[PDB]
Every structure is written in structure tokens, then in C-alpha cells.
Design a protein around this nucleic acid. Structure first.
Ligand SMILES: Nc1nc2c(ncn2[C@@H]2O[C@H](COP(=O)(O)OP(=O)(O)OP(=O)(O)O)[C@@H](O)[C@H]2O)c(=O)[nH]1
Ligand SMILES: [Mg+2]
Lengths: 360, 396, 272, 29, 10, 38, 98, 86
RNA sequence: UUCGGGUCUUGUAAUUGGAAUGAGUACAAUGUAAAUACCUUAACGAGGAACAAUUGGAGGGCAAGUCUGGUGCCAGCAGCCG
């Protein structure tokens, strides 16, 4: 009757996958042994977001809060505003909406309010330049995340507007069996309620690592001051490696804490980006889960994606097992014929998903 | 279509038609080619060649015949490949929706001569490779990684300690490949490789736009064929499932005992796979007209037997008009000679799925009039509707 | 004075500018501001300089009482005498009376914009884009090309402007190369001026003229401080090795002029 | 109260309709 | 809208 | 059901704030639409 | 231009395709059974006295057919065979007409 | 020949308006998108998206009219002497 | 063009009678290598002569019907829907 899961592991992913596949699911034993059992507030707010963009969905939480029953409805979207609790930033909520947005009856226009950055969740630039380009490859032509107000922790005060005009039947089949040649490194260096000097010092650290490279390095300085700067001082950097060849991107992101050295964070993220490039074959680790899901929900056709051995980590294992339990689809991996690198080709047949909610 | 072939048969001798005409008909069937149909190419289906009841006889006795029966259905698959894993939802015409308990491929009982000779003419029974460790759920994912060598809510992936990485990337070697009299040939060759990188795609024909699309479909189909061929037969079946033409045994559970008892081999058993939307139940917004040859117009809240996808059922539709696109107003009857927007509750289905409606399915009430009552195309699927009607208050 | 009355060209100019929300744009002589209001929508901060106070006030009246009003900044007076604040991009309807000084001031200004979309008369536009061997190749084309690259976006008909000017104008994009090539501005211009007295002359013919030969001789003796016939001999030589003396000035590319400069520096003679 | 609310609703519908109509007539030409 | 969250948490 | 006439406008706090903004907002600019001796 | 059509995908397998489903549909007594016997004999050289349910026969070196005699008296049958029949042999009584 | 991409005037409140009878169609031969006229809103009905339509020379700029849909004449459907095969 | 002018058995949505005949069916004969058909012809074959002629074009009129706009009752669009 219900596909059963355990724990809070991959809570968002299990919800969206059930939402896309249309199969009811049950998630149990959520933080049973902890002093504070059951869902966190942000997880509860996350479910409310699903109810807003869907119609006919039934969501039941246990008396203890440790078990949820989910019966997905259809994706309808529409215009709405969501208030994000301070426990999580907007990116924690924007990311799952990204999976569902292109397959809705009506275009998604959701206004997200709350803290806008964190250490463990996707930033604004990460979505804008790190995940959304991947969809452009997969056929979501029009997608935009407008930054109205930046809100740094702990008080936040920021605002972001998610708009996806493109509604598609399903993602196009993916054919990427090569290592993209990344042409340039770009990025956004931002700060709030503080002097512009911090942004300048931070790019200085990033360039120091990246000056040895043979590609041009151009990092934008986005100093936010005044009313639109939020309620707290904060500052962070994003560095994106771009392949104009086939429009591929790899990125790294962190934010700075009070008392931290702006130069040090810049050097860390630059050094962080190089590791991501070393570990990446066609998409970065932070981008891989979105790519895998999109191929799974493609047409009844075999899509190919090149993945490095480093990307096959503990997280990648659960993602495939989670996908199988809901979709019954298995990702077949084969070695590449090359000897320079030990990469492997991930071949996935789409489940023939179609956007039946959209009126014709 | 105009010019359609029409064969003529005069009489019957010894229970056979004239040999000459049958010869012509057989040839015409032999060389025939079939158009691709949208529905047939989007769902898996099979026609049951034989029927069998697998319920244990003791169970039929200790509980009685009323007990639900386990039955096995055999036949050739058609259309899209059927998934190998059990649990797939499927509909049997005139029976209901069931879930496949088991599925297994059997040798072809009527192998075509070309197939047989690579390796009776009539068959009428009725008459540590990481890839494995991913799906061994018993092994923990952490255990899997180490043998061959935390959570997705944290979007940022795991990175090593900052200082160790600084030493790691002090030099830029090992990533140079990712970034963009005899030595002269080397420079141009490197420069040649650079050019195709930086302008290659824009520069890398078919006469008509139609041929371009057919090329894209065919190329993708070829890519499928190569990929499956490399894979092992077990691996192939595991991903695609059972391809069309495969002879498959399929076992069902919780089948009504009536179906076992009420078995006439004349009446066919048609099996059709269901997509996720087909399972859903809700309001169906559709565009519908009275059929031209039906004598009578239809009425709102009047039963009508619809045929959507693989399923046939009766519902109470409500005929509507947009009222110059200001409101969804209820009608009393279908328009005499044009469609109208109709709403009815039933299993959802993808838009653009055509359907036809009939008011009488029993022979006893057949009469002589045309039995096809309505035809239409489903326009939208939804979980609610806001049909309204004009109410007038009258005073003096 | 003309005013543009085509909305499509104004929208196109903004789109080609492709202003990022992060970047700040600088506008010169907005006038009516129909192009301006679109720029405010896609620009975080906009700085506008207007020669006439009344236009600026009317522009204030157009952005009047709007959320974009706080972002918009209004400045008055000729842009030259003022020192322009930093701006990432410049898209403006400059008068052509000041186009030629303007384009160079943008280049000369430290930290110049990466991209700028400007309108010039057709003849000026061709001169900006004229390439070696082209009929319209001139001294100005060689100078601007070496500092920055300029490409022609579109051509705007005279009829679109009202009252229609007699000469057509074409919107053009210029991007300043970063880093700027390491060559002294005065020395480059000194080389270009002598060799472009008549593009169709031989480069040697320009040098052998008596008046400039005085100037080169005066310049050479200054370098010694740091025989007029001797200087004539040295110039006659260095042209022969470079072979540029035979070649026409118009045909010679920017790279060729560099071979002219370095060879002269070897002789010890510097233009300026 | 509902009188005022409906008025806002119908006005928004009319504006949305007219705004769409310019778009269709814009694309077609 | 159709459907809703059934919150029986105390 | 339909209504013949405009509903009478309602002075909510937001309406007052919006109105009172304009009344204050104007006065900075000293833009008063006033009769002046001719 | 008559060559031009809407692109579509045919999911027929490249190797070992299934037998084509042939539906013999017509009013009662129009000769559906005798037609199936006649076709089967010519193709296989064997006569089937009684036919019930699907009959799969070899029809060529690499082509096979399945014959189904739709119940003439049932409309519900006429629907579901119509959704799967690759070929229909529509029987018409010439003397009686349509 | 062409594919029906969208029915631009389906929503238009005004019945039998010139906008209602316009349908965007993409020519199969070249893939260029154009518009076609339909004889009337009733005939606008038989057309649905992704149907093959044969076009013939005829709001300005619309120079084509639909003469067949799915290989059958629109007039035949309008007089209702035939039924569209799907 | 309003102003009006010119002209006489016209109209019926009314009833009603018995004469003719081939499309078709068909003994036969003729026709033909043998047949079909034509030309012939016993016998049947007409009042909605339902033994049911088509393809295009122009123009109305109607409602407790529906949409849009506004110096009230109007106008535009249109109306298989009351
Ligand atoms: N004279 C003549 N009789 C025919 C012809 N075709 C069929 N028949 C007769 O029609 C009768 C019915 O034949 P069937 O084959 O049983 O037809 P059916 O479709 O199977 O009928 P049901 O199975 O009862 O639905 C038989 O007695 C045949 O002799 C024909 O061309 N000429
Ligand atoms: Mg029979």
C-alpha cells in the first residue's frame, strides 16, 4: 500500500520523488531516539510548501511526529508567498521546488522570505549559476531567481522570487560522455551592511589561488547596502567554473562568520572549487542529484552521463537506492574506454514521465 | 481512405472460400505495413493466448469456491517494454485493475522459421563490481564504498580540511587537462584542437525539416540498440524489462473467482499497462458532442458508458458552456450539432486521449438505433470544478 | 534638436547592454529618459549626467515618486570638466559634437567599463570599425582599435529620429581590453600621426617631409640628453629593415606599426 | 464587504484579459 | 484547493 | 449576484497610511496646487 | 509535400517482433469462422475444425499473425479488440449490405 | 502541410472574432511558423494540437487557411459527413 | 436620394381526377469464342411520384439568452447555449 522509508535521511528527496512519481509513501522512525523526536519545524514548513503547489495531496503526521504518510496530488503551482523559519534559509526550500516547478499546471511564482544564506544549504548564486544552468541543458528554457533583498544570518530579512516560465512535458534525454573543457572561472562576491573593503579583500584571496591558472578569472563584486541589505551583517563568495562549450558549470560556496578573515575565505573557496573540478566528470557533486533525477523522469529512452569515481560516495549510493524504491529504475554504470582517467558512464532509462497537469 | 482495398468472396465449399481470392488476401496481409499509433506505442499490452488457474485445490475446499483465485496468463507482449520488477499496475478489460505478482519469460511456442533455423506452424492453446553493490540493500552504503575501494539535506558536499587542501592545490598540476622547425606543427595542431573546442558546435545536411526529426529519432533509437547489446542479457532485461515479442508468463493474485468460472475462450482477455496518471481518480474536463448518427441528444446527469484508455465505465457527466469565457455554466442537454465542455468523475488520463460514449451495452435493449452516443477529446484533468448555473429570483 | 521616437531600438540598445542586476550603469544626456527608465529596471544604481538643467528636472519628473527614484542619481553639467564616478557600463545618447572626445575619455578613464553601447553617425561608425586595407581606414581607427575592440550592433535610420538628421547613425558596441596593452599613449599617437598624414602615401614619404624631420631630429637630440643628415640616414635605414617604408600606411596593420615602433626605439629615436 | 472584494476581482480579470489581448495581437502581426 | 495536512501532534 | 453601483470606499488604516504618505510626501517638495494672485 | 508528416516514434522491436493481431469483426453469420479456417489452411496447409480464442500461425519466413474472432453480439468486445487490433478484416454481407 | 502549435484565440471572449479563427501552424517542409485561418469557431473545434493540417492560400498578415485536418476536409467535418481519424 | 410615381387576374402555407413513362426487377430471344452490356420484349415497377440533385454565393428575423463600451431606454459584437 505504502512504500516505507526510515529516518529523516533525504526527507526532501523522498517527498519530491513521491510527488513526481505519483506513488504514496510512508516515512517512519523520524528521530525516534532523540530527546526532541519527530519532524523539525523547517521540515514541517517544507511539507506546507508542497501542499501549496499541489492539489488533492493528503499529508498525515503522527501524534509523536516521528511518522508521516504522504499521498501526492497533481502539480498546480500558482502564485504564493512562503515564510521560511529561521532554522533554514530560503535555499533549503527553493531547491526541492526546483525539481517540481517545470512540470506544473501553472507557472511557479513563489516569494520566499527568511534568511538567505547558510553554511550547509544552497546559496542564491548557487541556484542561479550552479543548478539552474543544468536545467537549461535539460530543456527548462526560462528560469529565474530574482534577489529582492539579501538576508544574512541570524536575523535574515532577505527576499527572493522564484519564477519559471518554461513548462515542459519532461526533461530531454541527456547525452554527455565527455569531459567538458571549462573556459573561464566567474563568481559573485557579496556582502551586506558592511564596508565594500571586505568584498575586495575576499576576491584578493580567491585570485591568489587562481592566478596560476591559464583561464581568465572575473569575480563580480556585489556590495549590498541600505534598506535592501537585510537586518544582519554578512558576507560570502561563490566561484563558478564555466564551460561555454556545452554550457556546463561547477561551483563552490561558503559564507563568512563574524571575526573571520575575508582573505582566508576567498582562498578556501578557490581551493574548494579546484577540488570540485578534480572530483567532477560532467557535473559537480552538488549538481549530480538534480541531474540523476531529471534523467530518471525523462522519456522511455537511455540517457548517458559521465561521472568520476570520486562522485560515487556514500551520498550517491542512497540517492540511487531511494530512486529505485520509488521508480524501480536502476542506474547502470560502465567504464569508459579511455585509460587517461578511470571515469564511468551512468546510463539511465527514463520512466516516460509526462506533465499531464498542464492544460492543452 | 479513398481507394481502400475491398476483397470479394462468392461462396463456401467444404467450409472453405475460393482458393484464388484467399491467395490474394494472404499476399495483401503479408506485405502490409502498419502506421505508428500513439496509444499502442505508449503502453504495454498483451493478448492472452491461454488461461490457467493456479489456486491450490485444497484451498478451494477448506474455504470454498468463493475464495479469490491465483491465475496465470500467458501471451506475447506488445508496444513498449513491460518492466521486469513485479508490482506493476495493469488493467484487464472487463475485470478490473490488478498488480502483477510475478513475471517470467518463456521460450517462443510458435517460433518463426527464420528464428528457428538460427537456433508447429500453428499455435492455438485455447482451442567487486560497484554496480551490483548499489542495489544489494543488505550491504550498507558505507560498507559498499570500502569493499570496492552523509545525507542529501546538506547541499554542500563533504570537503577535506582547509589546510590539507591548501597544500594539495599549491600547484595546479593534475587539472591542467580540464582547463583550455618541427615544433611549429605542434603549435598548429594544439591550435587546431583549440579551435574545434571554441567554435566546433556552431559549425557542426538533410533536405527537409521532416527528415531532420526522423534522423534525431532514429539516431536515438540506434543509441539504445548499441547500449543494450553491450549489456548482459540479464542486465538488459533488468533495465528495459521484457521487450515486445517476448513470450511471458504473468501471475495475478486476488482475481475474482467469477473470472475463473466465467471463462469463455471466445471472449478475449486483453491486458493493458497503466501509467501513473491512469491510476488517479478525479474530475475529468473533456470536450464532447452527440454523435451524428445517434438519434437523440444527451442529458446532464444521465448515465453514459465511456471508454478511456484501457478501461470502460459508466459515469454521470455534466455538459457545460463557457458563456463567452466568463463562467462555466451548466447546460441541460448537449448541443444538437456541436461539441460542449463536459465534466465527469472517473479515472484520470493524459490530455489528448480520445474517447467515445455509449448508452446501452446490453443486447436486450439494443433496438435498431445507432449505439454510439458521444465522442470527445479529454482536455484537462483536475481534482475540483466550479460548475455554476443561472438562478433567477422573481418578484412583483 | 532630434529626439528618437522608435521604442524598439531603445529596447534593443538596453538588451545588447545585457546589464546584470549587480552592475551599475552610467547614462549621459538621457534627455526624455524613455531609454533611461528601462535601464533603471535592470540596473541596481544609475548615474545620469545632463547638460541642460530642465531635462534633468523633467527626467526627475519621469522617475518621480517611484521605487526606482531612490536608485536613480541625477547629475548636471558637461561630463568632461567633471570627474565621472565609477561605473561598470555606459549606454548613452551622446551628441556627436562630443562623441570623439567622449569615446577616448571612456578609454582613458582608469578602470574603464567592460562594455558600452553608444550611437555615432554612420561615417564615424565606419571609421571606428575600419580595418586595415579598408577604404575608410584612418588614423583614428588604428588608435582606437589597438586600445579597444569595437563592433557594429545595428544601424538606426534617420527617419526614426525626429526632426530627422541629414546623416544616419548606427548603434555600436565598444569593449576596452583589460589589461590595456603596455604601450605609451603619446608614443603610439606620435607614431600614428606622422604615418597618417596621407594614408595612401608611402610610410617613407611621410618621414622624408622636411618639417617633421626637424621634429624627429629635435626629439632624437633630447634622447641623447637623457648630424641632422645622420638622423636622416638612420631613419632611411630602419625603414628598410622593417620594409614598412614601401608599404602603404593604410594597408599596414596594427601589428606592423609595432614593428615600426620597436625598430625606432632600437635606433634610439622616440616619437613622443 | 463582498461587494468591494468582487469589484477588485473583476477589475483584475479585465486588466489581465486586455493585457493578454495586446500580446496575442502583438505576436500575430 | 483540495487536500490538507492532518496535524494530530499535541 | 451583480451590483448596479460602485461600493462606497472604505478608509482602512492602510488607505490612511497611503494617503497620509502622499500628504507628507508632497510637502518636502513644496508642491501645492494652490490659487495665486493674478 | 504529401511525403511530409508529423514525426512519431514506433516502438516495434528491431529483432523478434510479436505476431500482428488480426481482428475478424463482423455481424453474426457473415462467415468469420470460415474465413479464419480458409486463411489458416492456405498458410499452414492444416484445417482447424473448431477455433476458439486467439490462434497464432506462421505466415512467412520472419512474419507471424494472430487471428481473433470478435464476438459479433457483444459491443464491449468490439471496443477492446479495436484498441489492440493491428489489422481488421471487416466482414460485410454483400447481399444484405452494411 | 503543418503541425498545429497553438490556438491563439481560443480564450477570446468575443465569439466568431477574427482572433478566434487564427491558429499557429509550423510548416513541415521548412519548420517556419505561420498562422492559418479556420472557416469558423465550430471548425476551430475539430483542430486540436499536434494534428496534421493541409494549408492553402487565403486581421492582416494571415495568408493561409486550413483545408484538411488529419487527412480529411474541414468542410466534410463541418457538414459532418465524415469523422476525423486519430 | 426623400417626395412618391407606373401597372393589372394576382396569390394561396388549399383540395382533388385519371392518362404516360423509364431507373430498376425479369420469362425469353438477340448479341458473344463463352459471357456482361446495348437494341428488343412477356410479367412487375409512381404522389412525399421517400423511385428523397448537387455544388457555391447573397441577405434576413427572432430570446425573462450571453459578452463588451457608455452624456439614461443606446450602440458594437454576435446568439446550436433560454
Ligand atoms: N452461400 C454462402 N454462405 C456463406 C458464405 N459465407 C458464409 N456463409 C455461410 O454462413 C454461415 C455462417 O458461417 P460462419 O463462419 O459460422 O460465420 P460466423 O461469423 O462464424 O458466425 P458466428 O460464429 O455464429 O458469429 C455458414 O453456414 C456459411 O455456410 C458465402 O459467401 N456464401
Ligand atoms: Mg464463428
Amino acid at each position: 500500500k505504502y512504500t516505507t522509508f526510515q529516518g529523516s535521511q533525504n526527507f526532501r528527496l523522498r517527498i519530491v520523488l513521491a510527488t513526481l512519481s505519483g506513488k504514496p509513501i510512508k516515512i517512519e522512525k523520524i528521530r525516534s531516539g532523540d530527546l526532541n523526536p519527530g519532524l523539525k519545524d523547517y521540515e514541517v514548513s517544507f511539507l506546507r510548501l508542497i501542499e501549496s503547489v499541489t492539489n488533492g495531496s493528503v499529508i498525515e503526521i503522527s501524534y509523536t511526529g516521528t511518522t508521516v504518510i504522504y499521498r501526492p496530488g497533481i502539480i498546480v503551482g500558482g502564485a504564493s508567498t512562503h515564510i521560511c523559519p529561521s532554522s533554514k534559509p530560503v535555499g533549503y526550500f527553493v531547491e526541492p521546488m526546483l525539481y517540481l516547478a517545470p512540470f506544473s499546471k501553472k507557472k511557479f511564482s513563489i516569494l520566499f522570505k527568511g534568511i538567505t544564506a547558510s553554511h550547509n544549504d544552497a546559496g542564491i548564486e548557487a541556484i542561479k549559476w550552479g543548478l539552474m544552468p543544468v536545467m537549461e541543458k535539460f530543456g527548462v528554457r526560462e528560469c529565474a531567481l530574482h534577489t529582492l533583498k539579501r538576508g544574512s544570518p541570524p536575523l535574515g530579512g532577505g527576499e527572493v522570487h522564484l519564477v519559471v516560465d518554461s513548462l515542459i512535458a519532461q526533461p530531454i534525454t541527456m547525452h554527455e560522455i565527455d569531459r567538458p573543457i571549462i573556459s573561464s572561472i566567474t563568481g559573485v562576491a557579496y556582502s551586506t551592511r558592511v564596508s565594500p573593503s571586505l568584498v575586495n579583500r575576499m576576491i584578493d584571496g580567491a585570485k591568489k589561488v587562481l592566478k596560476n591558472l591559464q583561464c581568465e578569472v572575473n569575480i563580480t563584486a556585489d556590495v549590498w547596502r541600505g534598506e535592501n541589505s537585510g537586518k544582519s551583517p554578512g558576507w560570502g563568495i561563490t566561484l563558478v567554473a564555466q564551460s561555454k562549450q556545452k554550457g556546463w558549470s561547477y561551483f563552490a560556496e561558503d559564507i563568512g562568520d563574524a571575526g573571520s578573515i575575508p582573505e582566508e575565505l576567498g582562498e578556501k573557496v578557490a581551493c574548494q572549487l579546484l577540488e570540485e573540478i578534480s572530483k567532477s566528470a560532467a557535473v559537480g557533486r552538488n549538481q549530480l542529484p538534480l541531474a540523476i533525477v531529471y534523467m530518471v523522469i525523462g522519456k522511455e529512452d537511455i540517457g548517458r552521463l559521465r561521472i568520476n569515481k570520486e562522485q560515487i560516495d556514500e551520498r550517491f549510493i542512497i540517492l540511487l537506492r531511494d530512486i529505485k524504491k520509488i521508480f524501480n529504475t536502476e542506474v547502470f554504470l560502465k567504464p569508459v574506454d579511455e585509460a587517461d582517467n578511470e571515469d564511468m558512464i551512468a546510463t539511465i532509462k527514463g520512466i516516460g514521465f509526462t506533465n499531464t497537469s498542464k492544460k492543452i | 481512405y479513398q481507394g481502400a482495398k475491398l476483397f470479394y468472396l462468392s461462396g463456401v465449399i467444404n467450409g472453405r472460400y475460393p482458393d484464388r481470392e484467399i491467395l490474394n488476401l494472404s499476399r495483401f496481409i503479408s506485405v502490409m505495413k502498419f502506421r505508428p499509433l500513439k496509444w499502442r506505442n505508449e503502453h504495454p499490452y498483451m493478448l492472452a493466448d491461454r488461461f490457467t488457474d493456479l489456486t491450490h485445490p485444497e484451498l478451494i475446499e477448506t474455504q470454498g469456491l468463493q475464495i479469490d483465485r491465483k491465475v496465470a496468463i500467458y501471451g506475447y507482449l506488445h508496444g513498449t517494454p513491460l518492466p521486469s520488477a513485479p508490482g506493476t499496475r495493469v488493467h484487464i478489460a472487463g475485470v478490473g485493475d490488478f498488480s502483477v505478482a510475478q513475471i517470467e519469460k518463456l521460450p517462443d511456442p510458435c517460433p518463426t522459421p527464420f528464428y528457428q533455423q538460427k537456433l508447429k506452424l500453428i499455435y492455438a492453446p485455447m482451442s567487486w563490481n560497484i554496480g551490483k553493490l548499489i542495489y544489494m540493500d543488505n550491504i550498507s552504503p558505507e560498507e559498499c564504498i570500502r569493499r570496492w575501494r552523509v545525507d542529501l539535506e546538506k547541499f554542500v558536499p563533504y570537503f577535506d580540511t582547509f589546510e590539507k587542501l591548501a597544500k594539495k592545490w599549491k600547484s595546479v598540476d593534475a587539472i591542467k587537462e580540464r582547463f583550455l622547425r618541427e615544433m611549429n606543427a605542434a603549435k598548429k595542431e594544439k591550435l587546431r584542437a583549440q579551435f574545434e573546442i571554441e567554435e566546433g558546435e556552431n559549425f557542426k545536411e538533410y533536405d527537409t525539416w521532416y527528415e531532420l526529426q526522423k534522423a534525431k529519432i532514429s539516431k536515438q533509437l540506434e543509441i539504445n540498440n548499441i547500449e543494450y547489446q553491450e549489456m548482459t542479457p540479464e542486465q538488459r532485461q533488468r533495465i528495459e524489462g521484457f521487450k515486445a515479442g517476448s513470450y511471458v508468463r504473468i501471475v495475478f493474485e486476488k482475481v475474482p473467482m467469477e473470472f475463473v468460472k466465467n471463462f469463455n475462450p471466445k471472449f478475449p482477455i486483453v491486458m493493458g499497462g497503466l501509467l501513473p496518471t491512469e491510476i488517479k481518480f478525479g474530475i475529468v474536463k473533456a470536450r464532447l458532442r452527440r454523435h451524428r448518427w445517434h438519434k437523440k441528444i444527451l442529458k446532464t446527469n444521465d448515465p453514459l458508458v465511456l471508454s478511456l484508455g484501457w478501461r470502460r465505465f459508466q459515469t454521470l457527466p455534466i455538459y457545460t458552456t463557457t458563456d463567452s469565457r466568463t463562467r462555466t455554466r451548466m447546460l441541460k442537454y448537449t448541443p444538437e450539432h456541436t461539441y460542449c465542455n463536459a465534466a465527469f468523475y472517473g479515472p484520470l488520463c493524459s490530455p489528448n486521449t480520445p474517447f467515445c460514449g455509449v448508452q446501452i451495452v446490453a443486447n436486450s435493449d439494443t433496438g435498431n438505433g445507432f449505439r454510439i452516443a458521444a465522442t470527445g477529446i479529454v482536455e484537462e484533468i483536475d481534482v475540483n470544478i466550479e460548475i455554476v448555473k443561472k438562478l433567477k429570483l422573481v418578484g412583483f | 534638436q532630434h529626439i528618437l521616437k522608435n521604442p524598439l531600438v531603445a529596447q534593443g540598445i538596453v538588451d545588447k547592454a545585457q546589464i546584470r542586476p549587480s552592475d551599475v550603469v552610467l547614462e549621459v544626456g538621457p534627455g526624455t529618459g524613455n531609454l533611461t527608465v528601462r535601464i533603471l529596471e535592470q540596473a541596481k544604481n544609475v548615474v545620469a549626467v545632463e547638460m541642460d538643467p530642465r531635462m534633468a528636472a523633467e527626467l526627475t519628473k519621469r522617475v518621480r515618486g517611484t521605487p526606482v527614484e531612490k536608485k536613480l542619481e541625477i547629475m548636471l553639467g558637461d561630463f568632461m570638466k567633471t570627474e565621472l564616478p565609477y561605473f561598470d557600463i555606459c549606454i548613452s545618447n551622446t551628441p556627436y559634437q562630443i562623441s570623439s572626445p567622449l569615446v577616448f575619455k571612456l578609454i582613458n578613464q582608469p578602470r574603464p567599463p567592460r562594455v558600452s553601447i553608444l550611437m555615432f553617425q554612420r561615417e564615424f561608425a565606419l571609421r571606428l570599425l575600419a580595418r586595415p586595407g579598408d577604404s575608410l581606414y584612418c588614423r583614428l581607427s588604428a588608435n582606437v582599435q589597438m586600445w579597444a575592440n569595437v563592433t557594429h550592433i545595428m544601424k538606426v535610420g534617420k527617419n526614426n529620429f525626429r526632426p530627422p538628421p541629414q546623416v544616419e547613425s548606427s548603434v555600436v558596441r565598444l569593449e576596452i581590453k583589460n589589461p590595456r596593452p603596455q604601450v605609451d599613449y603619446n608614443e603610439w599617437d606620435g607614431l600614428l600621426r606622422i604615418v597618417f598624414v596621407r594614408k595612401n602615401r608611402t610610410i617613407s614619404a611621410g618621414f622624408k617631409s622636411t618639417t617633421v624631420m626637424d621634429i624627429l631630429e629635435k626629439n632624437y637630440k633630447t634622447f641623447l640628453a637623457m648630424m641632422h643628415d645622420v638622423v636622416k640616414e638612420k631613419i632611411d635605414t630602419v625603414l628598410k629593415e622593417t620594409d614598412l617604408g614601401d608599404k602603404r600606411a593604410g594597408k599596414c596593420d596594427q601589428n606592423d606599426f609595432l614593428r615600426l615602433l620597436y625598430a625606432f626605439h632600437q635606433v634610439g629615436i622616440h616619437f613622443s | 464587504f463582498e461587494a468591494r472584494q468582487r469589484i477588485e476581482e473583476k477589475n483584475k480579470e479585465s486588466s489581465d484579459y486586455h493585457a493578454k489581448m495586446a500580446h496575442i495581437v502583438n505576436t500575430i502581426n | 484547493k483540495r487536500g490538507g495536512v492532518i496535524d494530530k501532534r499535541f | 449576484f451583480d451590483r448596479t453601483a460602485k461600493p462606497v470606499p472604505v478608509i482602512t488604516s492602510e488607505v490612511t497610511e497611503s494617503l497620509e504618505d502622499m500628504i507628507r510626501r508632497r510637502i518636502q517638495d513644496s508642491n501645492f496646487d494652490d490659487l495665486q494672485r493674478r | 509535400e504529401r511525403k511530409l508528416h508529423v514525426p512519431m516514434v514506433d516502438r516495434t522491436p528491431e529483432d523478434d517482433p510479436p505476431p500482428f493481431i488480426v481482428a475478424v469483426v463482423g455481424p453474426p453469420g457473415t462467415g468469420k469462422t470460415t474465413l479464419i479456417r480458409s486463411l489458416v489452411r492456405r498458410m499452414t496447409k492444416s484445417t482447424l475444425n473448431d477455433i476458439q480464442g486467439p490462434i497464432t500461425v506462421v505466415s512467412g519466413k520472419h512474419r507471424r499473425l494472430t487471428f481473433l474472432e470478435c464476438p459479433a453480439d457483444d459491443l464491449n468486445a468490439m471496443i477492446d479488440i479495436a484498441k489492440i487490433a493491428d489489422l481488421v478484416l471487416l466482414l460485410i454481407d454483400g447481399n444484405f449490405g452494411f | 502541410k503543418g503541425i498545429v502549435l497553438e490556438k491563439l484565440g481560443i480564450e477570446s471572449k468575443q465569439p466568431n472574432s477574427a482572433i478566434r479563427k487564427c491558429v499557429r501552424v509550423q510548416l513541415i517542409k521548412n519548420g517556419k511558423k505561420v498562422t492559418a485561418f479556420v472557416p469558423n469557431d465550430g471548425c476551430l473545434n475539430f483542430v486540436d494540437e499536434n494534428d496534421e493540417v493541409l494549408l492553402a492560400g487565403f486581421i492582416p498578415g494571415v495568408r493561409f487557411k486550413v483545408v484538411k485536418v488529419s487527412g480529411v476536409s474541414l468542410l466534410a467535418l463541418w457538414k459532418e459527413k465524415k469523422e476525423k481519424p486519430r
